[PDB]
């Protein structure tokens, strides 16, 4: 169901959402067990955190000590779970055409932390939750409408025999070369060159490296653009770009706000 379709009947149900990850926090430590130590007698006791509240012992547990207000919290001996907050934007497939996309913050825990990264389109299954937020930290006073978030419980994105058999072939060079772009009429030495570029040479320690570099020139209204598109589709981790400007993607590494951005070459 749509992120835009959620309503207060959902406030404790297990829901399903689809959308785009904008960013995530670093891992946030979330206390699961407080660890208390007695100032006078150095006795220690573990207290589970209940509904986010520290159930502080008012007096020391040991009846032979039983001093009031003497227990103190030892922060770095408490036990912490992992929490992370991720901001999920409404996918443009679902938006009405005349307004901004919505977004929902989602909380994700333990080994589900870093299930996704910025730019990932995902599904999540999670309980829709809501909580109040304060008017000011020095007061208990709460605003009369709650923050909403989804508290996730599942996330999801969006052979050798044949290899050696084909490797026995005699026509393999021509077979593979024509296969990179069989929709394109014969330019076969270009196709062979680009296949050899896909394979590449080798590296060495000492630098000399396995890169192979190719250029196509000649008339503009011809198959070279389609050829670049096909090798882009074939290669595992390459990119497509053009020699100047930036449609939020540019060639060179570049300093901007302060952050270094890596360009298309990098």
């Amino acid at each position: 169901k749509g992120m835009r379709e959620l309503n207060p009947n959902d406030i404790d149900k297990l829901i399903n959402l689809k959308g785009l990850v904008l960013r995530s926090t670093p891992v946030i430590p979330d206390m699961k067990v407080a660890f208390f130590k007695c100032n006078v007698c150095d006795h220690t006791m573990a207290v589970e955190i209940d509904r986010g509240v520290i159930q502080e012992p008012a007096r020391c547990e040991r009846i032979d000590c039983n001093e009031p207000n003497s227990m103190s919290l030892i922060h770095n001996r408490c036990s912490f779970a992992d929490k992370q907050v991720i901001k999920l934007q409404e996918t443009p497939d679902f938006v009405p055409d005349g307004q901004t996309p919505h977004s929902i913050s989602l909380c994700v825990y333990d080994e589900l932390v870093d299930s996704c990264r910025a730019g990932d389109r995902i599904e999540v299954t999670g309980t829709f939750r809501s909580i109040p937020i304060r008017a000011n930290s020095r007061q208990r006073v709460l605003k009369s409408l709650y923050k909403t978030y989804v508290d996730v419980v599942h996330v999801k994105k969006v052979d050798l025999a044949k290899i050696r058999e084909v490797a026995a072939r005699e026509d393999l060079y021509s077979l593979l070369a024509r296969s990179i772009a069989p929709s394109i009429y014969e330019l076969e030495d270009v196709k062979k060159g680009i296949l050899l570029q896909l394979f590449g040479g080798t590296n060495k320690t000492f630098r000399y490296r396995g890169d192979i570099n190719i250029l196509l020139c000649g008339d503009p209204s011809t198959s070279k653009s389609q050829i670049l598109q096909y090798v882009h589709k074939i290669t595992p981790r390459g990119v497509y770009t053009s020699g100047k400007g930036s449609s939020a993607v540019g060639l060179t590494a570049y300093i901007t706000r302060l952050v270094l951005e890596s360009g298309a070459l990098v």
Partner: peptide, 12 residues
């Protein structure tokens, strides 16, 4: 004398 209490470390 001042009303006071002895608080002892040896019972730690």
């Amino acid at each position: 004398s001042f009303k006071s209490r002895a608080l002892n470390h040896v019972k730690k």
